[PDB]
C-alpha cells in the first residue's frame, strides 16, 4: 500500500458541502461566501478566473471540499430552472478487470441535478460512489479512469492515481449535455 | 405526503458514510478521536464500546462513520461503529448471506426478493449492518417512500441468535457499538 493511495483514500473520502443560490464576493483570485455566520474562501486557480467577475456575483453555487472552509473551484451558475424531476440521468458504466480475460460490469443511472456543474463536483461524486461500492483506493489504483463524455462526442478524463488537477476544479460543463460515465477498475 | 417522522428516516438513512480502515482512534473520556491531514472524526461510546475500547490509543480499528447533526461541522460527529479490522487489508468474502425481502402487494399477494448479501468484515457493527441495509432497502425496495408501519430487518447467527432493526425508528444509539461475528451471520429477513 503506498503512501499516495492512501492520501487519495484519505482526501477524497470525506464529507462535502453545498452553498447554494449565493452571492460571492471576488477580491484578487479569491471569493468569498458568507453562510450561516461560517466564511468559506474559495480560490480562482483555472479558467474560473475568466468567469467570476471582481466584486460582487449573484446566484452561485458552490461544491465545497476542505483542502473557515478554504477550497478550490467548485463555483457554478445556480440552477435557473427549478427542476421536479433529474436535470440529466446519464448511464454509468463500471468496468473492473478480474483477470486475463474477465470483467465484472455495472451498469446503472447516474443523477445530475445541476444544470451547470462543476469537474471538482463530479469528480468528488462520482469518486465517492467508487470507494462505496467498488473499492476504490483499498489496491493501487494504477491506470484506472473516469471518462466523462459529452452529446457532442467531446470527453473529460480524470486519472484516479492523482487528484482531479487544481487548474480543473473550476472547470464547469452543461450537466443537460452529459451523455456517458465510464470507469476502468 | 410523507409524515415528518418517515421524512427523518429518509433524510438519516440517505446520508453519506465513510467507512474508514485500519486507523488509530485515541480515547479520552467516553469519545474516541481519529485524525488526518484532511479530516477529524469524533466518535461517542454510547453502550457496551466503553467496556471495549481502551483509554488513549488504540491502534488497527475500522470505523463506520455516519455524521451526526448539523450538515456544517468541519469534524465528522459520529455514534459508535468502531471495529477490530481485518486480520489483513486484502479484500475477501467473510460471509455470503442470504437476503430475502418480502413485500406485501395486497391482501393474498407477496413480492418476494432473494439476493447474496456479501459481509466483508471479521467483525461488524450493528450500525453498519442496519445503515448499510436500509440504504439498500431504500434503493431497491422503495422504503421510507411510504409510511414504514411494522416493517423490520431481522439478522439471524449461525448459532440461533438474533438482532431486531425496527424500520419505523432510528436505530438505538446505545447498540450503534455493538460488534458481531461477520461469519456467524446466517440470514437476514425483511418484510416490507
Known amino acids: 500500500r503506498s503512501q499516495a493511495t492512501q492520501d487519495l483514500s484519505e482526501y477524497y473520502n470525506r464529507p462535502y458541502f453545498d452553498l447554494r443560490n449565493l452571492s460571492g464576493y471576488r477580491e484578487g483570485n479569491t471569493v468569498t461566501f458568507i453562510n450561516h455566520y461560517q466564511q468559506t474562501d474559495v480560490k480562482l486557480e483555472g479558467k474560473d478566473k475568466d468567469k467570476i467577475k471582481d466584486g460582487n456575483n449573484e446566484n452561485l453555487d458552490v461544491f465545497v471540499v476542505r483542502e473557515d472552509n478554504n477550497s478550490i473551484g467548485g463555483i457554478t451558475k445556480t440552477n435557473r430552472t427549478q427542476h421536479i ?38 469528480d468528488f461524486k462520482l469518486r465517492k460512489h467508487l470507494i462505496d461500492k467498488h473499492d476504490l483506493y483499498k489496491t493501487e489504483p494504477k491506470d484506472s479512469k473516469i471518462r466523462v463524455t459529452m452529446k457532442n462526442g467531446d470527453f473529460y478524463t480524470f486519472e484516479l492515481n492523482k487528484k482531479l488537477q487544481t487548474h480543473r476544479m473550476g472547470d464547469v460543463i452543461d450537466g443537460r449535455n452529459i451523455e456517458k460515465i465510464e470507469v476502468n477498475l
Open 85 to 122: 424531476d433529474t436535470v440529466q440521468n446519464v448511464n454509468l458504466l463500471v468496468s473492473k478487470s478480474t483477470g486475463q480475460h474477465t470483467t465484472s460490469v455495472t451498469s446503472t443511472n447516474y443523477s445530475i441535478y445541476k444544470e451547470e456543474i462543476s469537474l471538482k463536483e463530479l
